[PDB]
Symmetry: D2
Subunit: 106 residues, 4 copies
Amino acid sequence: PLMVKVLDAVRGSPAINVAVHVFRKAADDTWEPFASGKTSESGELHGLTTEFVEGIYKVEIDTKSYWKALGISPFHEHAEVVFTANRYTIAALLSPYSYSTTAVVT
Amino acid sequence: PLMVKVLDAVRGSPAINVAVHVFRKAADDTWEPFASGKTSESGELHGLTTEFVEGIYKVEIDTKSYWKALGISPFHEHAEVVFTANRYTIAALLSPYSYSTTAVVT
Amino acid sequence: PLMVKVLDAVRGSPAINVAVHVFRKADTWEPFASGKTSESGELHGLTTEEFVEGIYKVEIDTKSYWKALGISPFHEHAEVVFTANDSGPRRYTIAALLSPYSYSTTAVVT
Amino acid sequence: PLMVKVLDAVRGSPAINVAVHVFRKADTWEPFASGKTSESGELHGLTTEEFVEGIYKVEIDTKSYWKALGISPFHEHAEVVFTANDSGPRRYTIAALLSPYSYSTTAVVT
């Protein structure tokens, strides 16, 4: 039920091999690792979970590493997306000094 | 080779039944109708063309009609995307007073 | 009452010296005003009395901007089309955020 | 040298009274400054000497903003994390453009 999709606004392409880490917020307010992976050649990451109970989740997209691998100076350390779970696609559109993120919930 | 995908940033969903018109620029600088359709339940419009020679194209996405059908006051008349053809996905992310458009060319 | 602001999402900077042409629908597009963005990425003083109700088009010459930086971008231009002043005079800021294969545009109306 | 600007993409307006909390990485997140956006959608005067090199997090409380307008938005907050002043002092504008299920954030560094 959770998928992440990442596009590169500079090249006009999927953002491939972007590392993504998902965390779930614990009772003591810390972030517990939940799942992770890297985007495919289509910029997508499937199969993160099945387990996906209500709670607050954080999806961290490693944008800095991506721009570094392209030789382009980036601004952000990463893009964080934090939401309460209540099909979820977390989309992100990446530029070096800007990004957007959209939840497509169907 | 040309596909249009539209998302609704207010609802977090595909933008369904959005009218899209494609034009090709003529030798006298006018816009000639080329193809059109409406987005599907997945917010996508396929099968616009096959015919898709080099030239300047305009994709008009009827955002105002979409927001009107939702009872939400919009700013723009439409979103226009103009490019030279040289697989093209024209993506758009819609809010009432803002939109983005991204070309995913693969 | 009409201002255009352009930012470069690759550099995190104002987009300087971007040409901007404004048209007003008469059903033809009549030239209305033009200018280029300053060092702040802004273009002021496009109009005044003159900015009556109508459908306006703001064409931002993003391709020339990118080409001058060595980049072959996707779009020919960014066009922003809108009805203005339909409920009396307003101040309009048309913002654009540019990347080689993507742009966003936002209207701030006060 | 740090300013936060927030806009509402549904209304085409400044996002007014949005809470903003800034942290600096010590590996814990230490509270650094906080405030709320004004009628212009801006928050100034967060820092000064004080804004040394470091990793900073700007947390923008978008959910409370939307909830006060009757909306149940997707995100808990918008978080913007960045290294600052790594090559000497700069002016940073952190902009955010909010929709109920989507946001964009941009850095303008001068």
